[PDB]
Design a binder for these strands. Structure first.
Ligand code: SAH
Length: 327
DNA sequence: GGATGCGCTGAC
DNA sequence: GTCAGCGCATCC
């Protein structure tokens, strides 16, 4: 994550729904905002969240009386994506894990914050012939909010990962916000190789599979794209090896394969998956952020998370718009 | 819970 | 056909 000198969100209160690691919290607090409520029902996510923020998020949002939620200016929510992801069954709103957006709407209807800041996977924008995105748009409009949505790729914002996500920013209409803009892309100057830990700290992640098939030669020049070098087994998810001179593939939460949830990388002549701390870095988390003691849970958590830097640029722009109040 | 072989869609 | 994918199935 980056340092933000001009704290555009100072004096603003926000809530951290589907909190996870608290990615939205890091991003908004870096702009000066204050978190006044957090919600996350996973046992291990609550533990790591508490480890880093000193609070245990409240459980199951579907059982929370929206009236008990503290007043706030901005509502943050990177809601569940298993039901919308290209990697899933795409049952969408029909999936028991796909109706969480309506809980968000329920809370918005009651608390009417100035801004609603949501995130989900790229496929969310095309799911069900665009009807899924349309439903969210119309729901927000019905609640009297504007609706700004765009898919942003983390590689365009200084983080070496091909993570494409749809970001939805909604402003309460009475605010008459007409100048919100998504951050402009800029040249990537950091690559996977730049975030790796020393070999001595990741030896246990090195695997030598006899069914390794290197399909492409290593590149010497860094490039802002994923560069597959080979595969193991049948080349499915978690069975693909990439160049550290390129960018990381999208980290996943329930991913399988031998290089599960992070993908495999060619590092100093050896093939290995990423260490949880490298996952943190690939997600824009500062080294000061404490990862969960269970490596399996840590991989899951970062795989479900958001790239801090991207949220920071968006948050700064939300604040920039909220603060432009000329006579 | 932890680990890993795979399905199979969206977007080229 | 090629590649990527906050995933799924199944085993202990
Ligand atoms: N009913 C529910 N109540 C509370 N949290 C829920 C929930 N259903 C799913 N979640 C939580 O929703 C999260 C979605 S992933 C979002 C992660 C978050 N942006 C962070 O930065 O890491 C998961 O952590 C999941 O456990």
């Amino acid at each position: 994550m980056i340092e933000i000198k001009d704290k555009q969100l100072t004096g603003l209160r926000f809530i951290d729904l589907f909190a996870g690691l608290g990615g939205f919290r890091l991003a908004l607090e870096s702009c000066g905002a204050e978190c006044v409520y957090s919600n996350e029902w996973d046992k291990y996510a609550q533990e790591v969240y508490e480890m880093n923020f000193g609070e245990k998020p409240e459980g199951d949002i579907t059982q929370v009386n929206e009236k008990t939620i503290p007043d706030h200016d901005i509502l943050c929510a990177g809601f569940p994506c298993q039901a919308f992801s290209i990697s899933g069954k795409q049952k969408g709103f029909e999936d028991s894990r796909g109706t969480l957006f309506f809980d968000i709407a329920r809370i918005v209807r009651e608390k009417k914050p100035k801004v609603v800041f949501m995130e989900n996977v790229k496929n969310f924008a095309s799911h069900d012939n665009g009807n899924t995105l349309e439903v969210v748009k119309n729901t927000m409009n019905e609640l009297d909010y504007s609706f700004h949505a765009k898919v942003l790729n983390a590689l365009d914002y200084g983080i070496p990962q091909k993570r494409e996500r749809i970001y939805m920013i909604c402003f309460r209409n009475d605010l008459n916000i007409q100048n919100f803009q998504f951050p402009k892309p800029f040249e990537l100057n950091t690559f996977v190789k730049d975030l790796l830990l020393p070999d001595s700290e990741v030896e246990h992640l090195v695997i030598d599979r006899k069914d390794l098939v290197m399909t492409n030669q290593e590149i010497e020049q860094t490039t802002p794209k994923t560069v597959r070098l080979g595969i193991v087994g049948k080349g499915g998810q978690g069975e693909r090896i990439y160049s550290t001179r390129g960018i990381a593939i999208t980290l996943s939460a329930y991913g399988g394969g031998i290089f599960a949830k992070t993908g495999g990388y060619l590092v100093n002549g050896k093939t290995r998956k990423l260490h949880p701390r490298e996952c943190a870095r690939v997600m824009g988390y500062p080294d000061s952020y404490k990862v969960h003691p269970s490596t399996s849970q840590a991989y899951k958590q970062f795989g479900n998370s958001v790239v801090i830097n991207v949220l920071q640029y968006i948050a700064y722009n939300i604040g920039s718009s909220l603060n432009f109040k000329p006579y």
